[PDB]
Structures are given as structure tokens and as C-alpha cells.
Amino acid sequence: AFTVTVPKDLYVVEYGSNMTIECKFPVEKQLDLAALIVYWEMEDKNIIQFVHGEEDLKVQHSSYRQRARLLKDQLSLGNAALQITDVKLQDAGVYRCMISYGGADYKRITVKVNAPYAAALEHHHH
Amino acid sequence: AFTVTVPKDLYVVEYGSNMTIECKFPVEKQLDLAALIVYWEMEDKNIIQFVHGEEDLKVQHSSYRQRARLLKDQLSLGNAALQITDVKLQDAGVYRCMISYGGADYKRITVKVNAPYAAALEHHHH
Ligand SMILES: Cc1c(-c2ccccc2)cccc1-c1nnc(Nc2cccc(CNCCO)c2)o1
């Protein structure tokens, strides 16, 4: 029974801080990047797609260019970690990590962003 | 290049009718049930999980208890079709057909429910 598990299903982050959200999956023996697909989406926006050993930038949403990365190194430990730098109020919401390695499964994580008045004000006047 | 395709991305169904929403994936030669995982979800509510050889109800959202089934027969033709019997207003929303058969992909399907006043009235209050 191939299962994806999330240590924390809810992260609370401060505006402008850095965030790492984890998804754990079981890895037997040595990791076979060829058979691994890691996909992170956030409310119908592709964040990262890791397939065939490499990330696909052709589909990455431009809002996450050069601020969202998968910690490729941690995949060998069965850890699919997404790191988003410079967290903004627009990053609050429901993330999904979908993994395909033998089986397939997925989990949802919720992110809340605390912000001072100033940052909230600019976000409000969109 | 593994693609899931949906003939219709929007279904309009009448309250109390039966609904089937189609989801296609490419299957060359013979289908390998061992490698197929089909997930149907509806706005972060799991409807069905088809893993290994048969669907798993272990996590089915109660709102779909005993009203949603996967048409196993058509999986061989690359058709992961979900059937909801006795469609209700709460079945309106965005469905997700997630499939892993070699590659992995998913498609969103939107469902609208037309209803007479009486059913709308009862749905509105409870
Ligand atoms: C469904 C899935 C699973 C999965 C499959 C079956 C059950 C549970 C999970 C696992 C890993 C990756 C994916 C996957 N799903 N596909 C991608 N990446 C992607 C990149 C760009 C665009 C799109 C399509 N966006 C919706 C419109 O088609 C998807 O990850």
C-alpha cells in the first residue's frame, strides 16, 4: 500500500520568511530517479514537476520562477520538500504534493501567512 | 508523454438522474492492472481509489457512500469512468480524475446540477 504522508498538514509562516513544506514517501534500497514523479501544485498552479530525474520548467508557473525549488537532495531519503523563499500573502492556500514512485498517492497541506498591516494593505489593494 | 484527456470538461445533469463522467488515458496493447492507480476526488473529498486490482473504499468520503462506483470494465479501453447514481445538488463542483499508469496526470471536470424548487429548497436549508 503506497502512501504519501505529511509530517505537518498545516504551516503558519511569517510574510517574507522562507518556507519548507514536506511530503514523505517510502523509498526502498536506493532511490530510482527514473521511476520518480514529484508534482507540487497550489490551487491549479503548477509549482514544480520533477520527472525523469529532472525538473520540468516548461510548465512551471512564472510566479514561482526562481523562488520555488524542490530540495532534490532530500529525495533520496524519501522526502519531497518544496521550498518557497520570500513568502507572500498570495502563497497562503492549499498545496498538494502528488508522488508517483511504484504506487501513486497525494496529500494536501494548508499554508497560512501572518503579515503586518503594511504588507496586508498592499495585498488588499490589488 | 502521458496525457489524460476528458471528452467533456463540463457536465450539466438533472437532480436525481445518474451521471457518468469520462476520463481517458492511453493504453497500448494490453492493460496492466498492477500499474494502474485511479483517483477521483471532488474538491478535496475522495470519491474512489482504484489501486492494484480493485477500488478501495477505505477513505471514501461519506457524502458519496454507496452512490459512486468506478466502471472497471472500461479501464481496459483506457477509460476511467466514474458513475454517480442519484445525483444530488451537493455533487455540483469540480471533479479531479487522477491517474498513474506509467506517467501521471490529472484533469478537472466541472459538474452543474439543475434542480426543481423543492429539491433546491430542501438543499438550501440543510
Ligand atoms: C496525478 C499525479 C499523481 C497521482 C496519480 C494517481 C493518483 C494519485 C496521484 C502523482 C504524481 C504526479 C501527478 C501529476 N499530475 N500531473 C502532473 N504534473 C502536471 C504538470 C503540468 C500540468 C499538469 C496538468 N494540470 C491540470 C490540467 O491537465 C500536470 O503531476
Curated annotation (Swiss-Prot), chains A, B:
Tissue-wise expression: Highly expressed in the heart, skeletal muscle, placenta and lung. Weakly expressed in the thymus, spleen, kidney and liver. Expressed on activated T- and B-cells, dendritic cells, keratinocytes and monocytes.
Domain of life of the organism encoding this protein: Eukaryota
Disulphide bridges, residue numbers:
C23-C97
**What's noted about post-translational modification?**
Ubiquitinated; STUB1 likely mediates polyubiquitination of PD-L1/CD274 triggering its degradation. Ubiquitinated by MARCHF8; leading to degradation. Deubiquitinated by USP22; leading to stabilization.
What does its record list under induction? Up-regulated on T- and B-cells, dendritic cells, keratinocytes and monocytes after LPS and IFNG activation. Up-regulated in B-cells activated by surface Ig cross-linking.
List, for all copies, the residue spans of the domain called Ig-like V-type: 2-110
What the protein does? Plays a critical role in induction and maintenance of immune tolerance to self. As a ligand for the inhibitory receptor PDCD1/PD-1, modulates the activation threshold of T-cells and limits T-cell effector response. Through a yet unknown activating receptor, may costimulate T-cell subsets that predominantly produce interleukin-10 (IL10). Can also act as a transcription coactivator: in response to hypoxia, translocates into the nucleus via its interaction with phosphorylated STAT3 and promotes transcription of GSDMC, leading to pyroptosis.
Q: Which family does it belong to?
A: Belongs to the immunoglobulin superfamily. BTN/MOG family.
Name the associated disease, please: Truncation of the 3'-untranslated (3'-UTR) region of CD274 transcripts leads to elevated expression of CD274 in multiple cancers including T-cell leukemia, diffuse large B-cell lymphoma and stomach adenocarcinoma. Disruption of 3'-UTR region is caused by structural variants that stabilize CD274 transcripts, leading to overexpression. Increased expression in tumors promotes immune evasion and tumor cell growth by allowing malignant cells to escape destruction by the immune system.
* Self-association and partners: Interacts with PDCD1. Interacts (via transmembrane domain) with CMTM4 and CMTM6. Interacts with (phosphorylated) STAT3; promoting nuclear translocation. Interacts with CD80.
The name of this protein is Programmed cell death 1 ligand 1
- From the UniProt record, report the name of the gene that encodes this protein: CD274
Measured against the full-length protein, the chain present covers 18 to 134 of 290
